[PDB]
Amino acid sequence: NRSLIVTTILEEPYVLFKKSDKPLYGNDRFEGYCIDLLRELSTILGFTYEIRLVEDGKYGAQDDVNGQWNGMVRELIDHKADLAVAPLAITYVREKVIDFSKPFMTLGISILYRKGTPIDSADDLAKQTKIEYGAVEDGATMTFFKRSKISTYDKMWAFMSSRRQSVLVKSNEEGIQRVLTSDYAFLMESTTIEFVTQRNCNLTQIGGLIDSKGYGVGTPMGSPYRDKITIAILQLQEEGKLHMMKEKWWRCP
Amino acid sequence: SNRSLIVTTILEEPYVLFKKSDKPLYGNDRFEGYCIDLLRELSTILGFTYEIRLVEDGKYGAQDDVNGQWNGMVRELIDHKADLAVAPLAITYVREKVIDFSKPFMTLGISILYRKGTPIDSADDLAKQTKIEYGAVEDGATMTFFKRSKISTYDKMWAFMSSRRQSVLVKSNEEGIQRVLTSDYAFLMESTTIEFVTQRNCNLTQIGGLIDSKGYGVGTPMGSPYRDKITIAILQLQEEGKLHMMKEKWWRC
Numbered sequence: 001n002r003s004l005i006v007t008t009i010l011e012e013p014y015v016l017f018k019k020s021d022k023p024l025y026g027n028d029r030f031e032g033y034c035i036d037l038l039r040e041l042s043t044i045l046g047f048t049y050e051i052r053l054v055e056d057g058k059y060g061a062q063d064d065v066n067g068q069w070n071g072m073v074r075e076l077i078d079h080k081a082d083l084a085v086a087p088l089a090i091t092y093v094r095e096k097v098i099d100f101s102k103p104f105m106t107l108g109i110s111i112l113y114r115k116g117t118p119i120d121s122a123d124d125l126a127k128q129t130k131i132e133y134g135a136v137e138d139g140a141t142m143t144f145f146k147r148s149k150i151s152t153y154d155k156m157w158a159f160m161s162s163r164r165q166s167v168l169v170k171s172n173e174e175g176i177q178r179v180l181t182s183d184y185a186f187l188m189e190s191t192t193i194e195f196v197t198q199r200n201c202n203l204t205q206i207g208g209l210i211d212s213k214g215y216g217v218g219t220p221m222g223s224p225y226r227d228k229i230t231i232a233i234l235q236l237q238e239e240g241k242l243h244m245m246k247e248k249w250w251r252c253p
Numbered sequence: 254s255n256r257s258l259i260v261t262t263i264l265e266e267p268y269v270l271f272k273k274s275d276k277p278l279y280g281n282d283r284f285e286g287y288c289i290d291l292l293r294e295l296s297t298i299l300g301f302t303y304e305i306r307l308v309e310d311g312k313y314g315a316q317d318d319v320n321g322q323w324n325g326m327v328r329e330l331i332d333h334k335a336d337l338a339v340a341p342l343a344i345t346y347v348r349e350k351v352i353d354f355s356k357p358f359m360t361l362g363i364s365i366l367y368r369k370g371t372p373i374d375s376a377d378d379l380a381k382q383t384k385i386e387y388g389a390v391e392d393g394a395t396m397t398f399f400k401r402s403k404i405s406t407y408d409k410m411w412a413f414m415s416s417r418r419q420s421v422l423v424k425s426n427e428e429g430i431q432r433v434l435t436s437d438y439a440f441l442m443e444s445t446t447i448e449f450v451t452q453r454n455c456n457l458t459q460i461g462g463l464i465d466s467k468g469y470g471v472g473t474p475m476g477s478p479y480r481d482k483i484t485i486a487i488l489q490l491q492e493e494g495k496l497h498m499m500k501e502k503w504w505r506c
C-alpha cells in the first residue's frame with residue numbers, strides 16, 4: 001500500500017513547478033514530461049507516489065577522492081528514494097551502482113551556441129580558448145568529458161577542469177544564461193538543446209551528437225521495479241504515448 | 254575450461270554475413286559484420302568463448318495466435334537452445350515479457366523503403382490506397398507492431414497486409430528489397446537497414462520519417478546473469494566510441 005518515494009530535479013520541460021497564483025501542495029506542485037510519465041507508470045503498475053526534489057540539486061557523480069556518489073544516484077544507492085524519474089542518463093559508471101529501466105528517450109551530448117559563427121564541431125572549440133565552454137557540474141556530460149580518452153574530448157576536459165569555477169554550472173538554465181550573456185558554448189544533451197533552440201531563435205546546435213545514450217528511470221540496484229518499469233515504457237512507446245508526450249512538452253523564422 | 258556459449262543469430266547485411274572467400278571457412282571464422290564485431294568485443298570484455306549458430310527456423314520471432322508458442326531466435330532463448338542472441342533483434346514489449354534483453358546497442362524505428370520519384374510521403378498515403386502493395390518480414394518486430402496496433406493508419410495497413418500476406422509478407426529483408434525492385438511495392442523496414450540499402454542503391458529511398466522508436470539488444474533467456482553484464486559492456490563500448498566506429502565501418506549516392 002506504501003507510496004513510492006520518487007526523487008527528481010527541476011529541468012524544463014521534464015519537471016517544472018506549475019505556475020499558479022493559488023498555492024499548490026504535494027505532487028500537485030509539479031508538471032512536465034517526466035511527471036506525465038510518472039503518472040502513466042503509476043496507472044500501469046498500480047502504485048501511489050510522493051515526489052521529492054533531490055536535496056543537493058544534483059544528478060550524480062562520484063567523488064574522485066572519497067569515492068562517494070551525490071545527487072539522485074546517491075539517493076537511490078542509500079535507499080532514500082524508490083525511483084528517480086527525471087532526465088537521468090543511463091551511463092556505464094551509474095549502471096554499476098544503480099539500476100535503470102530501459103530508455104524512454106534517446107539523445108546525445110551536443111553543443112549549444114549562438115548562431116552565425118564559424119564554429120562547427122567540438123574540435124573547433126577544443127583548439128581555441130577565446131570562446132569558453134562547459135557543462136553541468138556532477139552530471140553525465142561532465143563525467144563523459146572527465147573520463148574520456150578521446151583526444152578532442154580529453155583536451156576539452158583539461159580546459160573545463162582548469163576553468164571549472166567559471167565554466168561548470170549548476171543547471172542547464174545557468175548554462176543557457178552563460179551562452180546568452182557571454183562568449184560561451186554549452187555542452188548540453190540534444191533533447192534539451194531541441195527545446196531551447198525552439199524558444200531562443202538566436203541559439204543553435206553546433207555539430208551533431210558526440211555520443212549516444214538514453215534516459216531511464218533509476219532504481220536502487222536489485223529493485224523489482226526496474227523490469228516492470230521497462231515493460232511499461234515499452235508499452236507506452238508502442239501505443240504512441242511517449243511520442244505524444246514529447247510533442248506536448250516540446251511543442252523560429 | 255568453461256563451456257562455450259551458444260550464440261544464435263541470423264543472416265542480415267551488414268549485421269551478420271558469410272565472408273566472401275574462395276577458401277572454405279569453418280566455425281566462427283565464416284561470419285563477419287557489425288554484430289560479429291560486437292560479439293567479439295563482448296567476449297573479450299566478459300571473458301567467454303562462443304559458437305555462432307544461425308537460428309534454425311530462419312526467423313526473428315513472433316507468437317502464434319492459435320497455440321501461444323514463439324518461434325525464431327526468441328523461441329531458441331526461451332527453450333535454452335542458445336545462451337545469447339546477437340543480432341539486429343528488436344527489444345519489444347511482447348518479447349521483453351518472455352526473454353531478457355541487454356540495453357540497446359543501436360536505436361532505430363520502422364520506416365518505408367520504396368523507389369524514388371513518387372508523391373507517396375508517409376504511411377498514411379500508403380494506407381489510403383491499394384495500387385502500391387506493401388508488407389514486412391514475416392514473424393519479426395515490424396509485422397508484430399502492425400498486427401498489434403490500434404492506431405488507425407497502422408491497423409488499416411495490417412488488415413491489408415494480413416489479407417495479402419502470402420504475397421506481401423516475406424522471409425527476409427533481402428526478399429523485401431527484391432520485391433521493391435521488381436514490382437510496385439513498398440517495404441516496411443527498420444531505419445538502420447534502410448540507411449544501408451539506400452546508400453548502395455541510388456534508385457531507392459526512405460519515405461516519411463520513423464513510425465516508432467526501438468532499440469536492438471542482445472537477447473538472453475529470462476533470468477540470465479549475462480543480461481546485465483552485457484548491458485554494462487555495451488555502455489563501456491559506447492562510452493569509448495567503439496560502437497560508433499563499428500557502425501561507421503559497416504555502413505561506410
Ligand SMILES: N[C@@H](CCC(=O)O)C(=O)O
Pocket residue numbers: 059060087088089090135136138139140141142187188189
Ligand atoms: N541529464 C544529465 C544532466 C545534464 C548533463 O549532464 O548534460 C544527467 O543525467 O546527469
Ligand SMILES: N[C@@H](CCC(=O)O)C(=O)O
Pocket residue numbers: 313314341342343389390392393394395396441442443
Ligand atoms: N529486426 C527485426 C526483424 C526485421 C523487421 O521486423 O523489420 C526483429 O527483431 O524482429
Ligand SMILES: [Cl-]
Pocket residue numbers: 121122123124152
Ligand atoms: Cl569534433
Ligand SMILES: [Cl-]
Pocket residue numbers: 100101102230354355356484
Ligand atoms: Cl535492462
Ligand SMILES: [Cl-]
Pocket residue numbers: 368369370371458
Ligand atoms: Cl525521391
Ligand code: NA
Pocket residue numbers: 094095096097098099100221
Ligand atoms: Na545496474
Ligand code: NA
Pocket residue numbers: 348349350351352353354475
Ligand atoms: Na524480459
